Amino acid sequence: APDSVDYRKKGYVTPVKNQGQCGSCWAFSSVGALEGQLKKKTGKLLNLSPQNLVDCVSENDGCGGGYMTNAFQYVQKNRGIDSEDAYPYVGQEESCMYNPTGKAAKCRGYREIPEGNEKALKRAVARVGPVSVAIDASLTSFQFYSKGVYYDESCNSDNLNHAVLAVGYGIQKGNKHWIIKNSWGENWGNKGYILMARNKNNACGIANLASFPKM
Template structure:
């Protein structure tokens, strides 16, 4: 790097640091530029000019300081945080690019779905009429590959498709599937999907089809799981091989959608009850809306996330299991999320 650029970045950051307070990071200031350069190379970052790079370096430094401070107290926490592909973005930029989930108003759920009841998940119960203490559809080999949505607010499409991929992989006719919206501190609400598909095949399905063809939703801007499932009632969902992901909204490729891999027959509303969600997840994965506004959530690295949480549901994921950690003594939901523990997160 040219000495001029290094000097410019350091002076810029020094000016900012004098405004926000003394240096508190465990990493010496003269080494953070090298850390930033390595992070840029890892994530393929190229900025349009030196001023933009200096701006991103400032944001990166704030994240780095937070991460080091948080993890220095990890002995008293159940999870850790770390650098990831979002470490040069502000909260506002992250939300604009990645948070496309818009939860369906509660008042409209009753008209959109049949009431869910415990009989819908009887196949998940054992001979003692109880559900398992833990389950992981990942460990069963029935969860599709980890995918990156890019700078497109299509999380709503990824979560619904993740649910359908596992439904397609489960052998036999499927009569239970879910679409919960998870709020804070365990407040849950959900929907359940009825399907009739030939199981036994783990196929990557097409998020791009939902982005392009599900005109009730707003592509890379925003969407809801209810409208996505309604679309799949009408048109079904095809494979990603036939309709590959581009990460931008385009014209609907009608020819690619002619032969769907699966078609939805309906969906149910699940009560605001962790027990009801647990019964549904014991039968198959369900989609979920979560609040991703905290810097801890966005920089989650591993462990069991315990908050902070809010009520603003802005990010859609798939719940693919649940269990209990003996080391932390905590129950958790296992969610499919493209960052964290190899594409998953315990919460």
């Protein structure tokens, strides 16, 4: 595998979004991974609808939270997901209003990275594209991230409370990292991104709930 990978450089990653008050991080993570595969498969980058997921993935809890795998399984069984333009984000759960006419992507299933395996996660990012991951994002130190490679010994890998997108990996000044796209707006972090410690005993649980869609 390459020493570093950054899918932003290749137009596989849409702008950083802001989930607002809704607990829809799982939907932004899912859409990010789907977006990556859509660009890879069709050459077109577009915003897909996290609202479609919030409203229509019955296995998840809308703004109460959710699993990205349930989201990929929905898109698969539904035979599509709408674009953001066709099904805009409103930041509160509403009735499912999926419209096949606005369909922008399909899913043929998903793959999960073995729990805890950062080497497998690295391989997946290198081979497939951006990968949905879950982390402990609860710490104040995480809130206040500005630059460098984030590591906090207090991060709890058993408390996966937030879903984000691994769009690459690399090394900065000797510190191996994951390139993580968050959904807290471009004002948070470093332009909406965080570099998170890689190969540091699965810091923040980065490799405990990772998955990507098939297309």
